[PDB]
Amino acid sequence: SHMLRPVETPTREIKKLDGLWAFSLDRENCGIDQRWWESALQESRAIAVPGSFNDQFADADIRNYAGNVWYQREVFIPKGWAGQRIVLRFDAVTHYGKVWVNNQEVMEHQGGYTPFEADVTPYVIAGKSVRITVCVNNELNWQTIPPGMVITDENGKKKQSYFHDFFNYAGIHRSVMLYTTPNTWVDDITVVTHVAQDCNHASVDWQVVANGDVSVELRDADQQVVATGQGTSGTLQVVNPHLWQPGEGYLYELCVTAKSQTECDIYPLRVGIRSVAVKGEQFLINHKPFYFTGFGRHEDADLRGKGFDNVLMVHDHALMDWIGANSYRTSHYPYAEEMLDWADEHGIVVIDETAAVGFNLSLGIGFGNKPKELYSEEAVNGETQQAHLQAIKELIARDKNHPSVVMWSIANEPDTRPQGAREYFAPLAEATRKLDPTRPITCVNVMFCDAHTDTISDLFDVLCLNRYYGWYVQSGDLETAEKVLEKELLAWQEKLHQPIIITEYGVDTLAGLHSMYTDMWSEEYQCAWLDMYHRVFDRVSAVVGEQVWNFADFATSQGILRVGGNKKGIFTRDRKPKSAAFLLQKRWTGMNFGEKPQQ
Amino acid sequence: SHMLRPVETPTREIKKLDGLWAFSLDRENCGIDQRWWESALQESRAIAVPGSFNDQFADADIRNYAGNVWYQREVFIPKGWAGQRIVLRFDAVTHYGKVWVNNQEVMEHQGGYTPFEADVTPYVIAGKSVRITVCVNNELNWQTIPPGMVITDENGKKKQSYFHDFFNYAGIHRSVMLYTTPNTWVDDITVVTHVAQDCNHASVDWQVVANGDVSVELRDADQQVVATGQGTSGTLQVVNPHLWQPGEGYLYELCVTAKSQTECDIYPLRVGIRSVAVKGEQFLINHKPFYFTGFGRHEDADLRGKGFDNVLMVHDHALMDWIGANSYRTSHYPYAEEMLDWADEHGIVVIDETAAVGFNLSLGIGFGNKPKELYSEEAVNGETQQAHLQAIKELIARDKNHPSVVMWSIANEPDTRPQGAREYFAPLAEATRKLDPTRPITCVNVMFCDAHTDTISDLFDVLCLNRYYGWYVQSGDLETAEKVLEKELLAWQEKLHQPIIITEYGVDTLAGLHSMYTDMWSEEYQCAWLDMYHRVFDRVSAVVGEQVWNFADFATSQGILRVGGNKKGIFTRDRKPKSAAFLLQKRWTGMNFGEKPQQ
């Protein structure tokens, strides 16, 4: 379904609905029966949008709630929007939303991390106030991405069981907006940027969906027309192109005009001219080997949970830039698109991941009784696979034109031991390639699905390994950990001869815990253990990247493994550096940009 | 007064009285009037000896007590000691002790940090139990070393005012013992070790006090006699001597025999053959320039306060050895002699300091109303100067033969602005040189008594500067601090052309406080600020040493400046390293041993 990012144009306005909304729990689940959308929410309080609902209130009973909650506000339609196509858009509602405009049901969406929207032209009047009600549900089951199990206790109280190592935050996490187009509009754009080997010529394919005649102008960063074309599809030639390069990110603008006899629409799409390809064990950007440095991240901060926030995005980018990180992965869900606009503009390389974490009943992370077969009718089944395909489609439909996105990760750490695993994943691998043939794909690999055990990594282009030898096993023993790690990376190189990215390596580190014994949980162990990984990576020719787990400490489900959360951060949740931040700064700013270090 | 360290010999036994004693406060000050020493203490509890009394009980009312407390135990005289000279010895009682054996007053001492003892032969019977009572007083006045003022509130409640930045811990801090000699005994020994320029010959002068004919045997570390002599005084010649060198500490043994017609006594004194001298701006050990690295320390630990403890001494020496420290200063009181036995054996260089800190009414550290003239009848006067001379005599009488001790510090950070300062200090400087002509002297210099202000440093041999530019002033500004520091060190070199030791440089550092802004109280600021000092030291030819303030976080008087104590430690009070420990480790293990670093 077509999903262009709203931008203000001579033909397009936006009105953000961010701010304070009315908020209510629905502990008895009577809000659909009582049609709560037909009036003021009754027993409501103010909530910030965007934000997780969980931590705004310092209230355990709200933080731990499972079921429906209700958001509502009133808003004026701008008088001048009369005659315009008016769209209501939610950038993300975690995990499910249903939306009413006054008493009209307008939208519904499952999937906590990509946009949904409806044409609301027929249900509003320009110059009058409308009531927007949202029913938001945070429950996971075996057909949600990510999956989970709701346990209902003997008293009917719902508790969410889930298999991933981050807290199941919910709510309206990203911006809500009304926006306009003319009644003729550019509904969809796909670009493909081809790049000669010598890098001295490039071609830009376009395809546009719109209810009108289509022309394009490609403009350079100085706003000079370098190429023009006509029709819903075609190819622009670009002589001596300014390539989109990691560390710079030069962008063109492809202005798409849809002209009917009467009205017209202008949509500017930022275009980075760059090719991505795997050749052997090399990841090539613009025909040159790239070496990934940086992080697995999370959308996680004090008070706001997974809510988007510009100050956090500015501060965190300044920390990644300082430490010498050139890349990150959207672990473990699509991130706010503002992050990919930032990556495009500053030339940051991104592995774009779906929300399909948790397809694994043999980890110690998350959280009743787990089913015995992971791939069965009573767990990951045909409907799950459909839901996963839909999550991949929605991510690609959103992110297909971001030059910063160099690879699709379709899941994180599935259990691939059973026969069902390949049967479930094979068709997903094939459909991802059909959806976007311009980028390599991955499925991030769990440690116990080792080179001798894993059944699906041959179906993918890049080997993204999540590894924690010396932590969960060979606990505190760097000497054994180093042997096991090197052995396994070389076994992977022999088996598949793919480029290897270590997409997770990290140890829990309590800020301010110091030890002369360099032992687990200390700042000193974090440093010695990352250093040992680095030494091994640099001796393996197939390793083309390293993304530290994690950028910052983040919230998890309560348990015996998590000391107020996940402490594998390089930074604290309040963004203060641990000693290991200075270790990474020296390695990553001391290497040549984008080039595999040396011994 | 003669003070040889008790050692077990064929002629000498020791019985430690360390262990649990009875303990009592005397809030009404009626214990001398009621002669508490004549029976069991009445309302007593168990206390560990040795240890400060203050923190053993988790009790604020005991920790903050000012006045007399009472210690008592019973002990059996060994049956075989009949006919022996029996001595009762306290290695240190802070700050004053009076001792009774049953109902006989045997000893009294003022001075919290050196030994006192009495011949108790006439007051005990071998094979019977005796009662030892100690009245211990912790009050400071203008005639104590260190000085203070007891403020009595309107209700007669005593509160100790004092001018030094460490907590006024009190009690029996070091070992208590009975020991024997024969009725003929070696009462005193002075050695002087002279060393040819070429280092290929050395001479060892001896002087002995004893009530019998005296012979000496000098034995090497293999126990081979290298020299013999006769008489109360003389010189032993040593061909190709194994010099006592920093980082090694080769020791000989000078066995002193006192023979009467009937009985005899053997005392083995460890002797390190080494010369110390200042020439120009060089501190020479064995005719070679030395560069001091290491710490200002304190006797300070959880629960035991300033009590001596072998595990702490073993652990701390292993931390100083690891970090590459070659030296320390006994800031700000004589340390347990076991520390100087350790320094002798491992070749650690020590600046031996008296308890004369606080001679300064213009600092913000310590703690009623301060007197207006520091050097006056109503503050530091003639009797103070006598008490200071006595403290210097007792330190030298104890430590004169330790080869590890390379310099005497007679005080820390006196206010030398007034005319009285030189009048008070000059005679102290002269008497120290007469007491031990074999070692240079210092008086450690406070920051506000700058090169243009100070009135007494010409009377001393080495310039020991305590400096904290970028902390108490130019707060957080490394750029200004660096200019002011370099300017002042060069002004000191021009003024006196002495060797300069920085005997204090440090910043408060809360373990686990991390900052991207490198600002005060952070681990990062500690690192950047020590680094800036190091860069400046290495550009000044007169700087022959650096002793970081302080080895470890330590207790102080409560106030607005002290966040649970002094946080200038390199280590936490529980001996965990801050990031700056690794900075010092690299600089100090990366330089050539004992040699000024280079830019």
Side-chain angles (χ1 to χ4, degrees):
Chain A
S1 174
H2 296 141
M3 206 65 63
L4 282 182
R5 195 172 189 281
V7 46
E8 287 212 304
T9 284
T11 66
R12 291 183 174 229
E13 308 174 3
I14 299 168
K15 181 195 214 304
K16 288 298 171 98
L17 274 67
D18 300 358
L20 289 193
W21 294 44
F23 179 80
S24 181
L25 296 194
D26 180 9
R27 299 197 164 280
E28 307 99 302
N29 200 308
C30 61
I32 65 193
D33 300 323
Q34 283 159 201
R35 315 188 90 187
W36 279 11
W37 62 84
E38 294 189 339
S39 39
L41 294 185
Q42 205 195 334
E43 283 293 346
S44 79
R45 64 190 297 178
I47 196 173
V49 174
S52 297
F53 69 75
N54 303 262
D55 293 353
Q56 294 206 37
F57 307 114
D59 191 321
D61 286 358
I62 297 155
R63 175 174 166 100
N64 293 316
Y65 180 78
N68 294 325
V69 307
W70 291 86
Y71 282 86
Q72 196 178 251
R73 63 161 300 176
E74 282 216 292
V75 64
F76 274 95
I77 313 303
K79 188 158 197 210
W81 284 11
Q84 291 304 285
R85 172 163 170 281
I86 305 169
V87 179
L88 174 57
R89 172 151 165 146
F90 294 76
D91 275 352
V93 175
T94 306
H95 292 284
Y96 163 96
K98 193 172 266 189
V99 183
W100 298 259
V101 172
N102 295 338
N103 303 324
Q104 171 71 60
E105 200 192 315
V106 74
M107 254 168 276
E108 176 177 44
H109 190 268
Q110 191 71 54
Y113 301 100
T114 61
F116 55 102
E117 69 187 18
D119 182 333
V120 307
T121 310
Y123 310 119
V124 309
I125 307 180
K128 291 208 186 143
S129 188
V130 298
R131 190 232 286 105
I132 300 166
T133 314
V134 193
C135 182
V136 175
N137 173 285
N138 67 347
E139 294 181 277
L140 301 178
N141 62 42
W142 275 117
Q143 285 70 46
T144 58
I145 310 299
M149 311 178 309
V150 176
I151 316 303
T152 306
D153 78 16
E154 68 208 302
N155 307 129
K157 158 197 183 119
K158 287 170 177 200
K159 176 139 190 188
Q160 189 69 59
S161 201
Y162 51 106
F163 315 115
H164 56 268
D165 188 37
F166 54 91
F167 188 82
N168 182 50
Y169 279 113
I172 309 186
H173 282 144
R174 298 175 191 159
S175 274
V176 184
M177 70 200 72
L178 293 163
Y179 71 93
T180 59
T181 79
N183 291 130
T184 304
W185 82 102
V186 174
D187 198 43
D188 190 39
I189 311 157
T190 301
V191 303
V192 187
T193 61
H194 318 281
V195 177
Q197 169 85 238
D198 56 6
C199 280
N200 291 142
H201 195 94
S203 332
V204 173
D205 296 337
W206 81 85
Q207 293 222 302
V208 172
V209 173
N211 58 344
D213 306 326
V214 167
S215 56
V216 306
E217 291 196 330
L218 197 63
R219 289 196 209 83
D220 64 9
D222 295 332
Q223 297 218 197
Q224 280 179 293
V225 164
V226 81
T228 60
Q230 283 174 180
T232 65
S233 55
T235 294
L236 298 161
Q237 298 301 141
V238 189
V239 296
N240 296 314
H242 305 267
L243 296 181
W244 184 100
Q245 294 293 22
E248 170 161 72
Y250 188 104
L251 291 170
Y252 296 75
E253 171 186 282
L254 185 79
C255 189
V256 182
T257 305
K259 312 196 177 170
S260 80
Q261 43 200 103
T262 301
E263 58 204 280
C264 72
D265 181 46
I266 293 129
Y267 189 95
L269 178 68
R270 309 198 306 171
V271 178
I273 295 179
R274 69 95 184 86
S275 72
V276 168
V278 171
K279 190 186 160 224
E281 287 168 35
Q282 299 198 290
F283 194 106
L284 302 180
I285 310 182
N286 295 148
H287 305 283
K288 178 205 300 146
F290 186 69
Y291 191 86
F292 296 77
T293 67
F295 298 102
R297 296 181 51 86
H298 265 301
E299 296 188 328
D300 174 283
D302 293 313
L303 308 192
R304 80 180 54 267
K306 317 190 76 60
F308 180 67
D309 181 74
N310 284 137
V311 169
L312 191 59
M313 175 180 62
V314 172
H315 194 273
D316 289 1
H317 288 281
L319 293 178
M320 292 200 288
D321 189 22
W322 167 73
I323 205 170
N326 68 24
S327 76
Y328 62 96
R329 175 170 58 114
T330 76
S331 43
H332 299 292
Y333 35 83
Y335 284 10
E337 231 189 308
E338 295 84 333
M339 297 286 285
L340 285 323
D341 286 335
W342 191 290
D344 291 352
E345 209 195 336
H346 309 258
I348 299 169
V349 170
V350 180
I351 303 170
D352 209 357
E353 176 166 297
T354 71
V357 64
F359 283 70
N360 200 320
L361 292 172
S362 310
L363 294 173
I365 72 191
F367 279 56
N369 212 246
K370 301 168 164 213
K372 260 189 180 152
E373 302 279 32
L374 179 52
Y375 305 96
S376 53
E377 273 318 323
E378 54 151 345
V380 180
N381 73 4
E383 304 308 72
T384 314
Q385 187 191 44
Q386 286 312 301
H388 196 156
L389 181 52
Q390 186 59 32
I392 295 157
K393 276 176 196 158
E394 278 183 66
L395 179 57
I396 292 176
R398 194 193 73 172
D399 285 2
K400 52 169 160 181
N401 298 126
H402 287 296
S404 66
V405 171
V406 302
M407 184 154 58
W408 304 110
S409 172
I410 67 170
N412 181 82
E413 292 196 347
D415 186 353
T416 73
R417 295 174 287 188
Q419 194 224 279
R422 189 183 190 68
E423 186 191 11
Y424 177 87
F425 277 101
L428 293 184
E430 280 174 35
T432 302
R433 298 183 182 280
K434 285 175 235 111
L435 287 160
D436 174 37
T438 75
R439 292 180 179 83
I441 63 163
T442 197
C443 176
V444 176
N445 168 88
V446 76
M447 149 155 299
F448 72 69
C449 295
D450 67 25
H452 305 277
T453 295
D454 171 63
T455 66
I456 72 163
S457 288
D458 57 295
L459 297 164
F460 297 100
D461 303 310
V462 179
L463 201 69
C464 294
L465 304 178
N466 290 356
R467 290 299 180 282
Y468 42 56
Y469 301 118
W471 188 256
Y472 291 123
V473 282
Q474 311 91 24
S475 292
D477 175 5
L478 291 191
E479 172 164 320
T480 309
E482 181 172 348
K483 285 189 189 131
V484 175
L485 172 67
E486 189 151 39
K487 200 170 145 110
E488 204 222 345
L489 294 178
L490 288 174
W492 274 114
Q493 171 182 45
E494 180 288 299
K495 197 193 178 177
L496 293 178
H497 289 113
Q498 283 178 28
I500 303 165
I501 306 182
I502 311 289
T503 38
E504 183 202 67
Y505 69 119
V507 293
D508 290 78
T509 309
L510 184 58
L513 183 53
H514 289 285
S515 186
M516 292 303 302
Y517 302 103
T518 319
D519 44 9
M520 294 177 64
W521 295 89
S522 82
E523 290 201 31
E524 293 65 30
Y525 187 72
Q526 187 173 38
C527 298
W529 187 102
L530 289 166
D531 203 69
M532 179 271 286
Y533 272 58
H534 294 150
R535 293 200 302 280
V536 170
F537 296 162
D538 295 346
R539 294 192 296 262
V540 178
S541 56
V543 174
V544 303
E546 66 195 45
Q547 293 180 340
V548 178
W549 194 252
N550 187 279
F551 174 79
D553 292 346
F554 59 89
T556 64
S557 271
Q558 286 182 65
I560 72 190
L561 294 185
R562 293 286 173 264
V563 189
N566 185 293
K567 296 300 203 276
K568 302 212 169 58
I570 288 299
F571 294 96
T572 57
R573 198 182 203 205
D574 59 358
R575 269 51 183 170
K576 303 184 189 333
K578 300 188 188 159
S579 307
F582 303 113
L583 191 279
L584 294 178
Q585 192 280 343
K586 263 194 274 306
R587 175 180 173 76
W588 292 339
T589 68
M591 60 192 254
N592 292 132
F593 183 83
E595 289 196 12
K596 185 178 178 67
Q598 290 162 28
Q599 311 110 293
Chain B
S1 174
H2 296 141
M3 206 65 63
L4 282 182
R5 195 172 189 281
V7 46
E8 287 212 304
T9 284
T11 66
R12 291 183 174 229
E13 308 174 3
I14 299 168
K15 181 195 214 304
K16 288 298 171 98
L17 274 67
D18 300 358
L20 289 193
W21 294 44
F23 179 80
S24 181
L25 296 194
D26 180 9
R27 299 197 164 280
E28 307 99 302
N29 200 308
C30 61
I32 65 193
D33 300 323
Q34 283 159 201
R35 315 188 90 187
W36 279 11
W37 62 84
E38 294 189 339
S39 39
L41 294 185
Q42 205 195 334
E43 283 293 346
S44 79
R45 64 190 297 178
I47 196 173
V49 174
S52 297
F53 69 75
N54 303 262
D55 293 353
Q56 294 206 37
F57 307 114
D59 191 321
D61 286 358
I62 297 155
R63 175 174 166 100
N64 293 316
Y65 180 78
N68 294 325
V69 307
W70 291 86
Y71 282 86
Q72 196 178 251
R73 63 161 300 176
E74 282 216 292
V75 64
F76 274 95
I77 313 303
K79 188 158 197 210
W81 284 11
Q84 291 304 285
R85 172 163 170 281
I86 305 169
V87 179
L88 174 57
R89 172 151 165 146
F90 294 76
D91 275 352
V93 175
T94 306
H95 292 284
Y96 163 96
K98 193 172 266 189
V99 183
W100 298 259
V101 172
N102 295 338
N103 303 324
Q104 171 71 60
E105 200 192 315
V106 74
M107 254 168 276
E108 176 177 44
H109 190 268
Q110 191 71 54
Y113 301 100
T114 61
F116 55 102
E117 69 187 18
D119 182 333
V120 307
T121 310
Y123 310 119
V124 309
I125 307 180
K128 291 208 186 143
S129 188
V130 298
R131 190 232 286 105
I132 300 166
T133 314
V134 193
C135 182
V136 175
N137 173 285
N138 67 347
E139 294 181 277
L140 301 178
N141 62 42
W142 275 117
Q143 285 70 46
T144 58
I145 310 299
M149 311 178 309
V150 176
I151 316 303
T152 306
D153 78 16
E154 68 208 302
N155 307 129
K157 158 197 183 119
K158 287 170 177 200
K159 176 139 190 188
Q160 189 69 59
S161 201
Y162 51 106
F163 315 115
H164 56 268
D165 188 37
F166 54 91
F167 188 82
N168 182 50
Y169 279 113
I172 309 186
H173 282 144
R174 298 175 191 159
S175 274
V176 184
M177 70 200 72
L178 293 163
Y179 71 93
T180 59
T181 79
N183 291 130
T184 304
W185 82 102
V186 174
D187 198 43
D188 190 39
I189 311 157
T190 301
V191 303
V192 187
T193 61
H194 318 281
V195 177
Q197 169 85 238
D198 56 6
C199 280
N200 291 142
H201 195 94
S203 332
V204 173
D205 296 337
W206 81 85
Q207 293 222 302
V208 172
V209 173
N211 58 344
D213 306 326
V214 167
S215 56
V216 306
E217 291 196 330
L218 197 63
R219 289 196 209 83
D220 64 9
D222 295 332
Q223 297 218 197
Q224 280 179 293
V225 164
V226 81
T228 60
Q230 283 174 180
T232 65
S233 55
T235 294
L236 298 161
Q237 298 301 141
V238 189
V239 296
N240 296 314
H242 305 267
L243 296 181
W244 184 100
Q245 294 293 22
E248 170 161 72
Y250 188 104
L251 291 170
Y252 296 75
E253 171 186 282
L254 185 79
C255 189
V256 182
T257 305
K259 312 196 177 170
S260 80
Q261 43 200 103
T262 301
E263 58 204 280
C264 72
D265 181 46
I266 293 129
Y267 189 95
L269 178 68
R270 309 198 306 171
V271 178
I273 295 179
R274 69 95 184 86
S275 72
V276 168
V278 171
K279 190 186 160 224
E281 287 168 35
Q282 299 198 290
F283 194 106
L284 302 180
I285 310 182
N286 295 148
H287 305 283
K288 178 205 300 146
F290 186 69
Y291 191 86
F292 296 77
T293 67
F295 298 102
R297 296 181 51 86
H298 265 301
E299 296 188 328
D300 174 283
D302 293 313
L303 308 192
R304 80 180 54 267
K306 317 190 76 60
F308 180 67
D309 181 74
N310 284 137
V311 169
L312 191 59
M313 175 180 62
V314 172
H315 194 273
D316 289 1
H317 288 281
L319 293 178
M320 292 200 288
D321 189 22
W322 167 73
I323 205 170
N326 68 24
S327 76
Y328 62 96
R329 175 170 58 114
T330 76
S331 43
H332 299 292
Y333 35 83
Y335 284 10
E337 231 189 308
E338 295 84 333
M339 297 286 285
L340 285 323
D341 286 335
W342 191 290
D344 291 352
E345 209 195 336
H346 309 258
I348 299 169
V349 170
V350 180
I351 303 170
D352 209 357
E353 176 166 297
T354 71
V357 64
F359 283 70
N360 200 320
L361 292 172
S362 310
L363 294 173
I365 72 191
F367 279 56
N369 212 246
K370 301 168 164 213
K372 260 189 180 152
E373 302 279 32
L374 179 52
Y375 305 96
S376 53
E377 273 318 323
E378 54 151 345
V380 180
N381 73 4
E383 304 308 72
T384 314
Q385 187 191 44
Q386 286 312 301
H388 196 156
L389 181 52
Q390 186 59 32
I392 295 157
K393 276 176 196 158
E394 278 183 66
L395 179 57
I396 292 176
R398 194 193 73 172
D399 285 2
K400 52 169 160 181
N401 298 126
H402 287 296
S404 66
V405 171
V406 302
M407 184 154 58
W408 304 110
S409 172
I410 67 170
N412 181 82
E413 292 196 347
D415 186 353
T416 73
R417 295 174 287 188
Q419 194 224 279
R422 189 183 190 68
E423 186 191 11
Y424 177 87
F425 277 101
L428 293 184
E430 280 174 35
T432 302
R433 298 183 182 280
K434 285 175 235 111
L435 287 160
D436 174 37
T438 75
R439 292 180 179 83
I441 63 163
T442 197
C443 176
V444 176
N445 168 88
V446 76
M447 149 155 299
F448 72 69
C449 295
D450 67 25
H452 305 277
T453 295
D454 171 63
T455 66
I456 72 163
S457 288
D458 57 295
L459 297 164
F460 297 100
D461 303 310
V462 179
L463 201 69
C464 294
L465 304 178
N466 290 356
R467 290 299 180 282
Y468 42 56
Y469 301 118
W471 188 256
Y472 291 123
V473 282
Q474 311 91 24
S475 292
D477 175 5
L478 291 191
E479 172 164 320
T480 309
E482 181 172 348
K483 285 189 189 131
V484 175
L485 172 67
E486 189 151 39
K487 200 170 145 110
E488 204 222 345
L489 294 178
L490 288 174
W492 274 114
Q493 171 182 45
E494 180 288 299
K495 197 193 178 177
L496 293 178
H497 289 113
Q498 283 178 28
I500 303 165
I501 306 182
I502 311 289
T503 38
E504 183 202 67
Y505 69 119
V507 293
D508 290 78
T509 309
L510 184 58
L513 183 53
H514 289 285
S515 186
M516 292 303 302
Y517 302 103
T518 319
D519 44 9
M520 294 177 64
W521 295 89
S522 82
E523 290 201 31
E524 293 65 30
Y525 187 72
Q526 187 173 38
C527 298
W529 187 102
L530 289 166
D531 203 69
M532 179 271 286
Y533 272 58
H534 294 150
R535 293 200 302 280
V536 170
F537 296 162
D538 295 346
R539 294 192 296 262
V540 178
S541 56
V543 174
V544 303
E546 66 195 45
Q547 293 180 340
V548 178
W549 194 252
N550 187 279
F551 174 79
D553 292 346
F554 59 89
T556 64
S557 271
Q558 286 182 65
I560 72 190
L561 294 185
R562 293 286 173 264
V563 189
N566 185 293
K567 296 300 203 276
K568 302 212 169 58
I570 288 299
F571 294 96
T572 57
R573 198 182 203 205
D574 59 358
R575 269 51 183 170
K576 303 184 189 333
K578 300 188 188 159
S579 307
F582 303 113
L583 191 279
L584 294 178
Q585 192 280 343
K586 263 194 274 306
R587 175 180 173 76
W588 292 339
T589 68
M591 60 192 254
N592 292 132
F593 183 83
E595 289 196 12
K596 185 178 178 67
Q598 290 162 28
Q599 311 110 293

